[PDB]
Amino acid sequence: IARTFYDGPEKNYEKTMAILQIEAEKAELRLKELEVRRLMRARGDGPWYQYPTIDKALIDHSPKTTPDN
């Protein structure tokens, strides 16, 4: 039965090790992502949560009728 239908314990042991490593890395990444999201929303110094501001290319710098702008 063991020869035909089943494999050695090494396979299950090392598959479990790999699965645990993957899941631990995913959990750490999730927590780090939450921290990064909180910091980015609080500060606004990263790529995320960059709410639009007025483009300065619209400003007309040609001389006006009034000298003091």
Partner 1 sequence: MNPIIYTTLIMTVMSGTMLVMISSHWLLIWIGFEMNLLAMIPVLMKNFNPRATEAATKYFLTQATASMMLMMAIIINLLYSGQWTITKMFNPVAMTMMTMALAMKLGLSPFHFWVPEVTQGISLQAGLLLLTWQKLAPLSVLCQISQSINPNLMLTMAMLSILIGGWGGLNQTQLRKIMAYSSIAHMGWMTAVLPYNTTMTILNLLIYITMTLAMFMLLIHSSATTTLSLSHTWNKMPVITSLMMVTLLSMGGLPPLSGFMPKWMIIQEMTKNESIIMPTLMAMTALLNLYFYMRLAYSSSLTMFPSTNNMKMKWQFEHTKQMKLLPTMIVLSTLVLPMTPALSSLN
Partner 2 sequence: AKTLLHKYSDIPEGTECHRKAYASTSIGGATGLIVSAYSIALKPPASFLEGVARTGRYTFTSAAIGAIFGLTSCISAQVREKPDDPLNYFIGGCAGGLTLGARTRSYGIGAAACAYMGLTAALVKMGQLEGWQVFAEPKV
Partner 3 sequence: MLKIIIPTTMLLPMTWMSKHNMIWINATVHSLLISLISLSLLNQLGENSLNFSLTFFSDSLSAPLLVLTTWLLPLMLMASQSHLSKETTTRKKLYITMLILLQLFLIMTFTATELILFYILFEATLVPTLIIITRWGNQTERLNAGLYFLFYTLAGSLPLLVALVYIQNTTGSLNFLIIHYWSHPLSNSWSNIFMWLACIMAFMVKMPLYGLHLWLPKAHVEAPIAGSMVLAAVLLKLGGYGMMRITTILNPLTNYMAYPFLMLSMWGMIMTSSICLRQTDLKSLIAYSSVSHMALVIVAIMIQTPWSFMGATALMIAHGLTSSMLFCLANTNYERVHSRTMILARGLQTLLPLMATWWLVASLTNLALPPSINLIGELFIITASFSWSNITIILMGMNMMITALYSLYMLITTQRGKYTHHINNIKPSFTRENALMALHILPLLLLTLNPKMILGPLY
Where residue 44 falls (left for φ over 0; alpha for ψ -120 to 50; beta otherwise) is left
Q: Does 9 bind partner 3 (CB under 8 A)?
A: yes
Q: CA 57, CA 64: separation in Å to the nearest integer?
A: 17
Token digits of residue 13: 């042991």
**Stretch near partner 3 under the rule CB under 8 A, chosen from 24-32, 40-48, 50-58, 61-69:** 24-32
Residues between 4 and 63 that touch partner 2 (CB under 8 A): 34, 37-38, 41-42
- Quick one: what does residue 59 bind among partner 2, partner 1, partner 3, none, with the CB cut-off 5 to 8 Å set by partner type? none
